[PDB]
Amino acid sequence: PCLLKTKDWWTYEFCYGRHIQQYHMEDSEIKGEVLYLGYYQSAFDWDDKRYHSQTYGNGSKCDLNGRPREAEVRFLCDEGAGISGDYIDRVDEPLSCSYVLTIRTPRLCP
Ligand SMILES: OC[C@H]1O[C@H](OC[C@H]2O[C@H](OC[C@H]3O[C@@H](O)[C@@H](O)[C@@H](O)[C@@H]3O)[C@@H](O)[C@@H](O)[C@@H]2O)[C@@H](O)[C@@H](O)[C@@H]1O
């Protein structure tokens, strides 16, 4: 089941191994266009300490440059040691329409 987080205008939906989505909510409905940050492309897992990365590509065309959106996902230790499972921590956008999502998860903790 997909992880969700709202930051200002955009709500972000992370569907692990499928795609990443960005869209606007009003009340509790998706008002408008749904944008794709990217579709699942690759993943690397390392274990025994721990590391996990995924990449997502060919999302919606960027109006700034006409290039598809692209995203990478970092997976880091949930340092709150919480009890609600994984969560979207940050979304960063270091180049127009290129994103780095950071997910926190108890499974990546030492
Ligand atoms: O073009 C690259 C960016 O595209 C997308 O962001 C577009 C803008 O989104 C937000 O504004 C849209 C909404 O803002 C509201 O305040 C109202 O004005 C609405 O009518 C309007 O639809 C806002 O975040 C802007 O700063 C964005 O430019 C995203 O995909 C971005 O990640 C891209 O950078």
Side-chain angles (χ1 to χ4, degrees):
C2 305
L3 300 185
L4 297 168
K5 192 199 150 69
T6 298
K7 168 200 180 160
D8 314 299
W9 192 255
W10 296 115
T11 292
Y12 292 96
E13 192 175 288
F14 173 69
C15 303
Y16 182 103
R18 321 248 333 289
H19 50 253
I20 304 184
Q21 273 168 19
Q22 173 185 233
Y23 50 68
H24 179 67
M25 217 108 256
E26 220 64 63
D27 295 306
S28 305
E29 309 141 47
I30 292 170
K31 284 335 211 301
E33 26 102 73
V34 160
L35 294 161
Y36 269 62
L37 270 38
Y39 294 90
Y40 176 74
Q41 211 154 282
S42 83
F44 183 73
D45 190 62
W46 176 275
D47 185 4
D48 219 301
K49 299 130 176 223
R50 280 186 246 84
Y51 176 97
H52 192 94
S53 56
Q54 294 177 177
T55 72
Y56 292 75
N58 301 293
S60 311
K61 304 268 274 184
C62 197
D63 48 355
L64 279 11
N65 50 221
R67 264 195 39 242
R69 280 169 170 74
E70 62 172 19
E72 296 191 349
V73 191
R74 318 282 190 249
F75 287 87
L76 301 176
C77 172
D78 166 14
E79 305 270 13
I83 70 168
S84 38
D86 296 357
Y87 55 99
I88 297 168
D89 174 12
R90 293 192 58 79
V91 183
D92 291 294
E93 191 174 345
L95 292 78
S96 285
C97 294
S98 306
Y99 303 84
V100 183
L101 280 79
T102 290
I103 304 296
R104 300 272 174 173
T105 169
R107 286 185 275 294
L108 271 270
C109 294

Coordinates of all heavy atoms in Angstrom, one line a residue, residues 11-91:
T11 N 0.8 16.7 -3.0 CA 0.8 15.5 -2.2 C 1.6 14.4 -3.0 O 1.5 14.4 -4.3 CB -0.7 15.0 -2.1 OG1 -1.4 15.9 -1.3 CG2 -0.8 13.6 -1.4
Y12 N 2.4 13.7 -2.3 CA 3.3 12.7 -3.0 C 2.8 11.3 -2.6 O 2.6 11.0 -1.5 CB 4.7 13.0 -2.5 CG 5.2 14.3 -3.0 CD1 5.2 15.4 -2.2 CD2 5.8 14.4 -4.3 CE1 5.6 16.7 -2.7 CE2 6.2 15.6 -4.8 CZ 6.1 16.7 -4.0 OH 6.5 18.0 -4.4
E13 N 2.7 10.4 -3.6 CA 2.3 9.0 -3.4 C 3.4 8.1 -3.9 O 3.8 8.1 -5.1 CB 1.0 8.7 -4.3 CG 0.4 7.4 -3.9 CD -0.9 7.1 -4.5 OE1 -1.9 7.8 -4.2 OE2 -0.9 6.2 -5.5
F14 N 4.0 7.3 -3.0 CA 5.1 6.4 -3.3 C 4.5 5.0 -3.3 O 4.1 4.5 -2.2 CB 6.2 6.7 -2.3 CG 7.4 5.6 -2.5 CD1 8.2 5.6 -3.6 CD2 7.6 4.6 -1.5 CE1 9.2 4.7 -3.7 CE2 8.6 3.7 -1.6 CZ 9.4 3.7 -2.7
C15 N 4.5 4.4 -4.5 CA 4.1 3.0 -4.7 C 5.3 2.2 -5.0 O 5.8 2.2 -6.1 CB 3.0 2.9 -5.8 SG 1.5 3.9 -5.4
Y16 N 5.8 1.5 -4.0 CA 7.0 0.9 -4.0 C 7.2 -0.1 -5.2 O 6.3 -1.0 -5.4 CB 7.2 0.1 -2.7 CG 8.5 -0.6 -2.5 CD1 9.5 0.0 -1.7 CD2 8.8 -1.8 -3.1 CE1 10.8 -0.7 -1.5 CE2 10.0 -2.5 -2.9 CZ 11.0 -1.9 -2.1 OH 12.2 -2.6 -1.9
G17 N 8.2 0.1 -6.0 CA 8.4 -0.8 -7.2 C 7.4 -0.6 -8.3 O 7.4 -1.4 -9.2
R18 N 6.7 0.5 -8.3 CA 5.7 0.8 -9.3 C 5.9 2.2 -9.8 O 6.3 2.4 -10.9 CB 4.2 0.6 -8.8 CG 3.9 -0.5 -7.9 CD 3.0 -1.6 -8.5 NE 2.1 -1.2 -9.5 CZ 1.0 -0.4 -9.3 NH1 0.7 0.0 -8.0 NH2 0.2 -0.1 -10.3
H19 N 5.5 3.2 -9.1 CA 5.7 4.6 -9.6 C 5.6 5.5 -8.4 O 5.2 5.1 -7.3 CB 4.6 4.9 -10.6 CG 3.2 4.6 -10.1 ND1 2.5 3.5 -10.5 CD2 2.5 5.1 -9.1 CE1 1.4 3.4 -9.9 NE2 1.4 4.4 -9.0
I20 N 5.9 6.8 -8.7 CA 5.8 7.9 -7.8 C 4.9 8.9 -8.4 O 5.1 9.3 -9.6 CB 7.2 8.5 -7.5 CG1 8.2 7.4 -7.0 CG2 7.1 9.6 -6.4 CD1 9.6 7.9 -6.6
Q21 N 4.0 9.5 -7.6 CA 3.0 10.4 -8.1 C 3.0 11.7 -7.3 O 3.3 11.7 -6.1 CB 1.6 9.8 -8.1 CG 1.4 9.0 -9.4 CD 0.1 8.0 -9.3 OE1 -0.7 8.2 -8.4 NE2 0.1 7.0 -10.1
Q22 N 2.6 12.8 -8.0 CA 2.6 14.1 -7.3 C 1.2 14.8 -7.8 O 1.0 14.8 -9.0 CB 3.8 14.9 -7.8 CG 3.8 16.4 -7.4 CD 5.0 17.2 -8.0 OE1 5.7 17.8 -7.2 NE2 5.1 17.2 -9.3
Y23 N 0.4 15.2 -6.9 CA -0.9 15.8 -7.3 C -1.4 16.6 -6.2 O -0.8 16.7 -5.1 CB -1.9 14.6 -7.7 CG -2.0 13.5 -6.7 CD1 -2.5 13.7 -5.4 CD2 -1.5 12.2 -7.0 CE1 -2.6 12.7 -4.4 CE2 -1.6 11.2 -6.0 CZ -2.1 11.4 -4.7 OH -2.2 10.5 -3.7
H24 N -2.5 17.4 -6.4 CA -3.0 18.3 -5.4 C -4.4 17.8 -4.9 O -5.2 17.3 -5.7 CB -3.1 19.8 -6.0 CG -3.7 20.8 -5.0 ND1 -3.1 21.1 -3.8 CD2 -4.9 21.4 -5.0 CE1 -3.8 21.9 -3.1 NE2 -4.9 22.2 -3.8
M25 N -4.6 18.0 -3.6 CA -5.7 17.5 -2.9 C -6.6 18.7 -2.6 O -6.0 19.8 -2.1 CB -5.3 16.9 -1.6 CG -6.1 15.6 -1.2 SD -5.2 14.1 -1.3 CE -5.9 13.4 -2.8
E26 N -7.9 18.6 -2.8 CA -8.7 19.6 -2.2 C -9.8 18.8 -1.5 O -10.4 17.8 -2.0 CB -9.2 20.6 -3.2 CG -9.3 22.1 -2.6 CD -8.0 22.8 -2.2 OE1 -7.1 23.0 -3.0 OE2 -7.9 23.2 -1.0
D27 N -9.9 19.1 -0.2 CA -10.8 18.4 0.7 C -10.3 17.0 1.0 O -9.6 16.8 2.0 CB -12.3 18.5 0.3 CG -12.8 19.9 0.3 OD1 -12.7 20.5 1.4 OD2 -13.3 20.4 -0.7
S28 N -10.5 16.0 0.0 CA -9.8 14.7 0.1 C -9.9 14.1 -1.2 O -9.9 12.9 -1.4 CB -10.5 13.8 1.2 OG -10.5 14.4 2.5
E29 N -9.9 14.9 -2.3 CA -10.1 14.4 -3.6 C -8.9 15.0 -4.4 O -8.3 16.0 -4.1 CB -11.4 14.9 -4.2 CG -12.6 14.6 -3.2 CD -13.7 15.6 -3.2 OE1 -14.1 16.2 -4.2 OE2 -14.1 16.0 -2.0
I30 N -8.4 14.2 -5.4 CA -7.4 14.7 -6.3 C -8.0 15.7 -7.3 O -8.8 15.3 -8.2 CB -6.7 13.6 -7.1 CG1 -5.9 12.7 -6.2 CG2 -5.8 14.1 -8.2 CD1 -5.4 11.4 -6.8
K31 N -7.8 17.0 -7.0 CA -8.2 18.1 -8.0 C -7.2 18.2 -9.1 O -6.1 18.8 -9.0 CB -8.4 19.4 -7.2 CG -9.7 19.4 -6.5 CD -10.7 18.4 -7.2 CE -12.2 18.9 -7.0 NZ -12.7 19.0 -5.6
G32 N -7.5 17.6 -10.3 CA -6.8 17.9 -11.5 C -5.9 16.8 -12.1 O -6.2 15.6 -12.1
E33 N -4.9 17.3 -12.8 CA -3.8 16.5 -13.3 C -3.0 15.7 -12.2 O -2.8 16.3 -11.1 CB -2.8 17.5 -13.9 CG -2.9 18.9 -13.3 CD -1.8 19.3 -12.3 OE1 -0.6 19.5 -12.7 OE2 -2.1 19.5 -11.0
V34 N -2.7 14.5 -12.5 CA -1.9 13.7 -11.6 C -0.5 13.6 -12.3 O -0.4 13.3 -13.5 CB -2.5 12.3 -11.5 CG1 -1.5 11.2 -11.1 CG2 -3.7 12.3 -10.6
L35 N 0.6 14.1 -11.6 CA 1.9 14.0 -12.3 C 2.7 12.8 -11.8 O 2.6 12.4 -10.7 CB 2.7 15.3 -12.0 CG 2.1 16.5 -12.7 CD1 2.7 17.8 -12.0 CD2 2.3 16.6 -14.2
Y36 N 3.4 12.2 -12.8 CA 4.3 11.1 -12.5 C 5.7 11.6 -12.3 O 6.3 12.1 -13.3 CB 4.2 10.1 -13.7 CG 3.2 9.0 -13.5 CD1 1.8 9.3 -13.4 CD2 3.6 7.7 -13.4 CE1 0.8 8.3 -13.2 CE2 2.6 6.7 -13.3 CZ 1.3 7.0 -13.2 OH 0.4 5.9 -13.0
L37 N 6.2 11.5 -11.1 CA 7.7 11.7 -10.9 C 8.5 10.7 -11.6 O 9.6 11.0 -12.0 CB 7.9 11.7 -9.4 CG 7.8 13.0 -8.6 CD1 6.7 13.9 -9.1 CD2 7.8 13.0 -7.1
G38 N 8.0 9.5 -11.8 CA 8.7 8.4 -12.5 C 8.1 7.1 -12.4 O 7.3 6.9 -11.5
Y39 N 8.4 6.2 -13.2 CA 8.0 4.8 -13.2 C 9.2 4.0 -12.7 O 10.3 4.2 -13.2 CB 7.6 4.3 -14.5 CG 6.4 5.0 -15.1 CD1 6.6 6.1 -15.9 CD2 5.1 4.5 -15.0 CE1 5.5 6.8 -16.5 CE2 4.0 5.1 -15.6 CZ 4.2 6.3 -16.3 OH 3.1 6.9 -16.9
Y40 N 8.9 2.9 -12.0 CA 9.9 2.0 -11.5 C 10.9 1.5 -12.5 O 10.4 1.1 -13.6 CB 9.3 0.8 -10.8 CG 10.4 -0.1 -10.3 CD1 11.3 0.3 -9.3 CD2 10.6 -1.3 -11.0 CE1 12.3 -0.6 -8.9 CE2 11.7 -2.1 -10.7 CZ 12.5 -1.8 -9.5 OH 13.5 -2.6 -9.2
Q41 N 12.2 1.6 -12.3 CA 13.2 1.2 -13.2 C 14.2 0.2 -12.6 O 14.6 -0.7 -13.3 CB 13.9 2.4 -13.7 CG 14.4 2.4 -15.0 CD 14.5 3.9 -15.5 OE1 13.5 4.5 -15.9 NE2 15.8 4.5 -15.5
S42 N 14.7 0.5 -11.4 CA 15.7 -0.3 -10.9 C 15.8 -0.2 -9.4 O 15.3 0.7 -8.8 CB 17.1 0.1 -11.4 OG 17.6 1.2 -10.7
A43 N 16.4 -1.2 -8.7 CA 16.6 -1.2 -7.3 C 17.8 -2.0 -7.0 O 18.2 -2.9 -7.7 CB 15.4 -1.8 -6.6
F44 N 18.5 -1.5 -5.9 CA 19.6 -2.3 -5.4 C 19.4 -2.5 -3.9 O 19.1 -1.5 -3.1 CB 20.9 -1.5 -5.6 CG 22.1 -2.3 -5.2 CD1 22.6 -3.4 -5.8 CD2 22.8 -1.8 -4.0 CE1 23.7 -4.2 -5.4 CE2 24.0 -2.6 -3.6 CZ 24.4 -3.7 -4.3
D45 N 19.6 -3.7 -3.4 CA 19.5 -4.0 -2.0 C 20.9 -4.6 -1.5 O 21.4 -5.5 -2.2 CB 18.4 -5.0 -1.8 CG 18.1 -5.2 -0.3 OD1 17.7 -4.2 0.3 OD2 18.2 -6.4 0.2
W46 N 21.3 -4.2 -0.3 CA 22.5 -4.8 0.3 C 22.2 -5.2 1.7 O 21.6 -4.4 2.4 CB 23.7 -3.9 0.1 CG 25.0 -4.5 0.9 CD1 25.3 -4.3 2.2 CD2 26.0 -5.3 0.3 NE1 26.4 -5.0 2.5 CE2 26.9 -5.6 1.4 CE3 26.2 -5.9 -0.9 CZ2 28.0 -6.5 1.2 CZ3 27.3 -6.7 -1.1 CH2 28.2 -7.0 0.0
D47 N 22.6 -6.3 2.2 CA 22.3 -6.8 3.6 C 23.2 -7.9 4.2 O 23.1 -9.1 3.9 CB 20.8 -7.3 3.6 CG 20.3 -7.7 4.9 OD1 21.0 -7.6 5.9 OD2 19.1 -8.2 5.0
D48 N 24.0 -7.5 5.2 CA 24.4 -8.3 6.4 C 25.9 -8.1 6.7 O 26.4 -7.1 6.3 CB 24.0 -9.8 6.5 CG 23.6 -10.3 7.9 OD1 24.3 -10.1 8.9 OD2 22.4 -10.8 8.0
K49 N 26.4 -2.7 6.8 CA 25.3 -3.4 7.2 C 24.1 -3.5 6.2 O 23.9 -4.6 5.5 CB 24.8 -2.9 8.6 CG 25.8 -2.9 9.7 CD 25.9 -1.5 10.4 CE 26.9 -1.6 11.6 NZ 26.3 -0.9 12.8
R50 N 23.4 -2.4 6.1 CA 22.2 -2.4 5.2 C 22.1 -1.1 4.3 O 22.6 -0.1 4.7 CB 20.9 -2.5 6.0 CG 20.6 -4.0 6.3 CD 19.3 -4.2 7.0 NE 19.4 -4.7 8.4 CZ 19.5 -3.9 9.5 NH1 19.6 -2.6 9.3 NH2 19.6 -4.5 10.7
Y51 N 21.7 -1.3 3.0 CA 21.6 -0.3 2.1 C 20.5 -0.7 1.0 O 20.3 -1.9 0.7 CB 22.9 -0.1 1.4 CG 22.9 0.8 0.3 CD1 23.4 2.2 0.5 CD2 22.5 0.5 -1.0 CE1 23.4 3.1 -0.6 CE2 22.5 1.4 -2.1 CZ 23.0 2.7 -1.8 OH 23.0 3.7 -2.9
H52 N 19.7 0.3 0.6 CA 18.7 0.1 -0.4 C 18.4 1.3 -1.2 O 18.3 2.4 -0.6 CB 17.4 -0.4 0.3 CG 16.4 -1.0 -0.7 ND1 16.3 -2.3 -0.9 CD2 15.4 -0.4 -1.4 CE1 15.3 -2.5 -1.8 NE2 14.7 -1.4 -2.1
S53 N 18.4 1.2 -2.5 CA 18.2 2.4 -3.4 C 17.2 2.0 -4.5 O 17.2 0.8 -4.8 CB 19.5 2.9 -4.0 OG 20.0 1.8 -4.7
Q54 N 16.4 2.9 -5.0 CA 15.6 2.6 -6.2 C 15.7 3.8 -7.2 O 15.9 5.0 -6.8 CB 14.1 2.4 -5.8 CG 14.0 1.1 -5.0 CD 12.6 0.8 -4.6 OE1 12.3 -0.3 -3.9 NE2 11.6 1.7 -4.8
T55 N 15.5 3.5 -8.4 CA 15.4 4.6 -9.4 C 14.0 4.5 -10.2 O 13.5 3.4 -10.4 CB 16.6 4.7 -10.3 OG1 16.5 3.6 -11.2 CG2 17.9 4.6 -9.5
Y56 N 13.5 5.7 -10.5 CA 12.2 5.8 -11.2 C 12.4 6.8 -12.3 O 13.1 7.8 -12.1 CB 11.1 6.4 -10.3 CG 10.7 5.4 -9.3 CD1 11.6 5.1 -8.2 CD2 9.5 4.6 -9.4 CE1 11.2 4.2 -7.2 CE2 9.2 3.7 -8.4 CZ 10.1 3.5 -7.3 OH 9.7 2.5 -6.4
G57 N 11.9 6.5 -13.5 CA 12.2 7.3 -14.8 C 11.0 7.5 -15.7 O 9.9 7.0 -15.4
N58 N 11.1 8.3 -16.8 CA 10.0 8.6 -17.7 C 8.8 9.1 -17.0 O 7.7 8.6 -17.3 CB 9.7 7.4 -18.5 CG 10.9 7.0 -19.3 OD1 11.3 7.7 -20.2 ND2 11.4 5.8 -19.0
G59 N 8.8 10.0 -16.1 CA 7.6 10.5 -15.5 C 7.0 11.6 -16.5 O 7.4 11.6 -17.6
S60 N 6.2 12.4 -16.0 CA 5.6 13.4 -16.9 C 6.6 14.4 -17.4 O 7.6 14.8 -16.7 CB 4.5 14.2 -16.1 OG 3.6 13.2 -15.5
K61 N 6.5 14.8 -18.7 CA 7.3 15.8 -19.3 C 7.4 17.1 -18.5 O 6.3 17.5 -18.0 CB 6.8 16.1 -20.7 CG 6.8 14.9 -21.6 CD 8.1 14.7 -22.4 CE 8.0 15.6 -23.7 NZ 9.2 15.3 -24.6
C62 N 8.6 17.6 -18.3 CA 8.8 18.9 -17.6 C 8.5 20.0 -18.6 O 9.0 20.0 -19.7 CB 10.3 19.0 -17.2 SG 10.5 20.2 -15.9
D63 N 7.8 21.0 -18.1 CA 7.5 22.1 -19.1 C 8.7 23.0 -19.2 O 8.8 23.8 -20.2 CB 6.2 22.9 -18.6 CG 6.2 23.3 -17.2 OD1 7.2 22.9 -16.5 OD2 5.3 24.0 -16.7
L64 N 9.6 23.0 -18.2 CA 10.7 23.8 -18.2 C 11.7 23.4 -19.3 O 12.3 24.3 -20.0 CB 11.4 23.9 -16.8 CG 10.8 24.8 -15.8 CD1 9.4 25.4 -16.1 CD2 10.7 24.1 -14.5
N65 N 11.8 22.1 -19.6 CA 12.7 21.6 -20.6 C 12.2 20.5 -21.5 O 13.0 19.9 -22.3 CB 14.0 21.1 -19.8 CG 13.7 20.1 -18.6 OD1 14.3 20.2 -17.6 ND2 12.7 19.2 -18.8
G66 N 10.9 20.1 -21.4 CA 10.4 19.0 -22.1 C 11.0 17.6 -21.9 O 10.8 16.7 -22.7
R67 N 11.8 17.4 -20.8 CA 12.4 16.2 -20.5 C 11.5 15.4 -19.5 O 10.9 16.1 -18.7 CB 13.7 16.5 -19.6 CG 15.1 16.6 -20.2 CD 16.1 16.6 -18.9 NE 15.6 15.6 -17.9 CZ 15.2 15.9 -16.6 NH1 15.3 17.1 -16.0 NH2 14.8 14.9 -15.8
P68 N 11.4 14.1 -19.6 CA 10.6 13.4 -18.6 C 11.1 13.6 -17.1 O 12.3 13.8 -16.9 CB 10.8 11.9 -18.9 CG 11.4 11.9 -20.3 CD 12.2 13.2 -20.4
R69 N 10.2 13.6 -16.2 CA 10.6 13.7 -14.8 C 11.4 12.4 -14.4 O 11.2 11.3 -15.1 CB 9.4 13.9 -13.9 CG 8.9 15.4 -13.8 CD 7.5 15.5 -13.1 NE 7.0 16.8 -12.8 CZ 6.6 17.7 -13.7 NH1 6.6 17.4 -15.0 NH2 6.2 18.9 -13.3
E70 N 12.2 12.5 -13.4 CA 13.0 11.3 -13.0 C 13.2 11.4 -11.4 O 13.1 12.5 -10.9 CB 14.4 11.3 -13.7 CG 15.2 12.5 -13.4 CD 16.7 12.4 -14.0 OE1 16.9 11.6 -14.9 OE2 17.5 13.2 -13.6
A71 N 13.3 10.3 -10.8 CA 13.4 10.3 -9.3 C 14.4 9.2 -8.8 O 14.4 8.1 -9.5 CB 12.1 10.3 -8.6
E72 N 15.1 9.5 -7.8 CA 15.8 8.4 -7.0 C 15.3 8.5 -5.6 O 14.8 9.5 -5.2 CB 17.4 8.7 -7.0 CG 18.0 8.6 -8.4 CD 19.5 8.6 -8.3 OE1 20.1 8.8 -7.3 OE2 20.1 8.4 -9.4
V73 N 15.4 7.4 -4.9 CA 14.8 7.2 -3.6 C 15.9 6.7 -2.7 O 16.6 5.6 -3.0 CB 13.7 6.1 -3.6 CG1 13.0 6.2 -2.2 CG2 12.7 6.4 -4.7
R74 N 16.2 7.4 -1.6 CA 17.1 7.0 -0.6 C 16.2 6.3 0.5 O 15.1 6.7 0.7 CB 17.8 8.2 0.1 CG 18.3 9.2 -0.9 CD 19.6 8.8 -1.6 NE 20.3 9.9 -2.4 CZ 20.3 9.9 -3.8 NH1 19.8 8.9 -4.5 NH2 20.9 11.0 -4.4
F75 N 16.8 5.3 1.2 CA 16.1 4.6 2.2 C 17.0 4.8 3.4 O 18.2 4.4 3.4 CB 15.9 3.2 1.8 CG 14.8 3.0 0.8 CD1 15.1 3.1 -0.6 CD2 13.5 2.7 1.2 CE1 14.1 2.9 -1.5 CE2 12.5 2.5 0.2 CZ 12.8 2.6 -1.1
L76 N 16.6 5.4 4.5 CA 17.4 5.6 5.6 C 16.7 5.1 6.9 O 15.5 4.9 6.9 CB 17.7 7.1 5.8 CG 18.3 8.0 4.7 CD1 18.3 9.4 5.2 CD2 19.8 7.5 4.4
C77 N 17.5 4.8 7.9 CA 17.0 4.4 9.2 C 15.9 5.4 9.8 O 16.1 6.6 9.7 CB 18.2 4.4 10.3 SG 17.7 4.1 12.0
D78 N 14.8 4.9 10.3 CA 13.9 5.7 11.0 C 14.5 6.0 12.4 O 14.4 5.1 13.2 CB 12.5 5.0 11.2 CG 11.6 5.7 12.2 OD1 11.9 6.9 12.5 OD2 10.6 5.1 12.6
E79 N 15.0 7.2 12.5 CA 15.7 7.5 13.8 C 14.8 7.8 15.0 O 15.2 7.9 16.1 CB 16.7 8.6 13.6 CG 17.7 8.4 12.5 CD 19.0 7.8 13.0 OE1 19.1 7.2 14.1 OE2 19.9 7.8 12.2
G80 N 13.5 8.0 14.7 CA 12.5 8.1 15.7 C 12.2 6.7 16.3 O 11.5 6.6 17.3
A81 N 12.7 5.6 15.8 CA 12.3 4.2 16.2 C 10.7 4.1 16.4 O 10.2 3.5 17.4 CB 13.0 3.8 17.4
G82 N 10.0 4.6 15.4 CA 8.6 4.7 15.4 C 7.9 3.3 15.3 O 8.6 2.3 15.1
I83 N 6.6 3.3 15.3 CA 5.8 2.1 15.3 C 4.8 2.1 14.1 O 4.1 1.1 14.0 CB 5.0 1.8 16.6 CG1 3.9 2.9 16.9 CG2 6.0 1.8 17.8 CD1 2.9 2.5 18.1
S84 N 4.7 3.2 13.3 CA 3.8 3.2 12.2 C 4.5 2.8 10.8 O 4.0 3.0 9.8 CB 3.1 4.5 12.0 OG 4.0 5.6 12.4
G85 N 5.6 2.0 10.8 CA 6.2 1.6 9.6 C 6.8 2.7 8.8 O 7.0 3.8 9.4
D86 N 7.0 2.5 7.5 CA 7.8 3.4 6.6 C 7.1 4.7 6.4 O 5.8 4.8 6.5 CB 8.0 2.7 5.3 CG 8.9 1.5 5.3 OD1 9.4 1.1 6.4 OD2 9.1 0.9 4.3
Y87 N 7.8 5.8 6.1 CA 7.2 7.0 5.8 C 8.0 7.9 4.8 O 9.3 7.8 4.8 CB 6.8 7.8 7.0 CG 8.0 8.1 8.0 CD1 8.6 9.3 8.0 CD2 8.4 7.1 8.9 CE1 9.7 9.6 8.9 CE2 9.4 7.4 9.8 CZ 10.1 8.7 9.8 OH 11.1 8.9 10.6
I88 N 7.4 8.7 4.0 CA 8.0 9.6 3.2 C 8.5 10.7 4.1 O 7.8 11.3 4.9 CB 7.1 10.2 2.1 CG1 6.6 9.1 1.2 CG2 7.9 11.3 1.3 CD1 5.4 9.6 0.2
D89 N 9.8 10.9 4.1 CA 10.5 11.9 4.9 C 10.6 13.2 4.2 O 10.1 14.2 4.7 CB 11.8 11.3 5.4 CG 12.7 12.2 6.2 OD1 12.2 13.3 6.7 OD2 13.9 11.9 6.4
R90 N 11.3 13.3 3.1 CA 11.6 14.5 2.4 C 11.4 14.2 0.9 O 11.6 13.1 0.5 CB 13.1 14.9 2.5 CG 13.7 15.2 3.8 CD 15.1 15.8 3.6 NE 15.1 17.0 2.8 CZ 14.7 18.2 3.2 NH1 14.4 18.4 4.5 NH2 14.7 19.2 2.3
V91 N 11.0 15.3 0.2 CA 11.2 15.2 -1.2 C 12.1 16.4 -1.6 O 11.8 17.6 -1.3 CB 9.8 15.3 -2.0 CG1 10.0 15.2 -3.5 CG2 8.8 14.3 -1.5

